[PDB]
Amino acid sequence: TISAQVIDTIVEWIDDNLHQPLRIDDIARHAGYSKWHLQRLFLQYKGESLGRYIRERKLLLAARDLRDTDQRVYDICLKYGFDSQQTFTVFTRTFNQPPGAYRKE
DNA sequence: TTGGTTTTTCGTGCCATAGGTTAATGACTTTACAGAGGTTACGTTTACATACATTTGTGAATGTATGTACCATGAACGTACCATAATAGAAAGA
């Protein structure tokens, strides 16, 4: 029990939520835990900054949609959180693996 | 000419120096419970005078008690309506 069961709710919010980005103000509210209700968790349970963990989660989620043989490549990053194609093109810094070649795999 | 690795800023995240509301046991203090002490107005126990009753003798009410000496010689002394048929009894002729 950390901050009255915030771990059991963060995962549910990440699962249920739409492609809306996750920031301090966005998740600070209906979360039931403010900035410090999340800082301790991100420091202890995860040990990684939000901008990298969210990007990794989006990449792991899109790894299946890229294999689902979808022709609308521009909408793949949009349906998962990346509001722009250039920002998602994160993939170069993470995998150094072609968008298209991976999409071909 | 186009995709992707490399690099630098920059707002954002993590760490550290400051300074204030407010949990701690307490010390409170206030209310409640526990201690004896003088006073009140009864409740039980006791003696004493007078009263209804109940216990005695005495004057009247009834009640059996034995008899009355001219002559009195049998009757119901006034009852009563008379229905109808099963079962025996004492005799009489069969």
Curated annotation (Swiss-Prot):
Residues 8-105 form the HTH araC/xylS-type domain. Pfam families: HTH_18. The keyword Nucleotide-binding does not apply. Residues 25-46, 73-95 bind DNA. InterPro entries: Homeodomain-like_sf, HTH_AraC, HTH_AraC-typ_CS, MarA-like, Tscrpt_reg_AraC-type_HTH. Keywords: Activator, DNA-binding, Transcription, Transcription regulation. One of its GO terms (molecular function) is DNA-binding transcription factor activity. Coiled coil: none annotated. SMART domains: HTH_ARAC. Probable transcriptional activator. Confers a multidrug resistance phenotype in E.coli. This is Transcriptional activator RamA. It comes from Klebsiella pneumoniae.
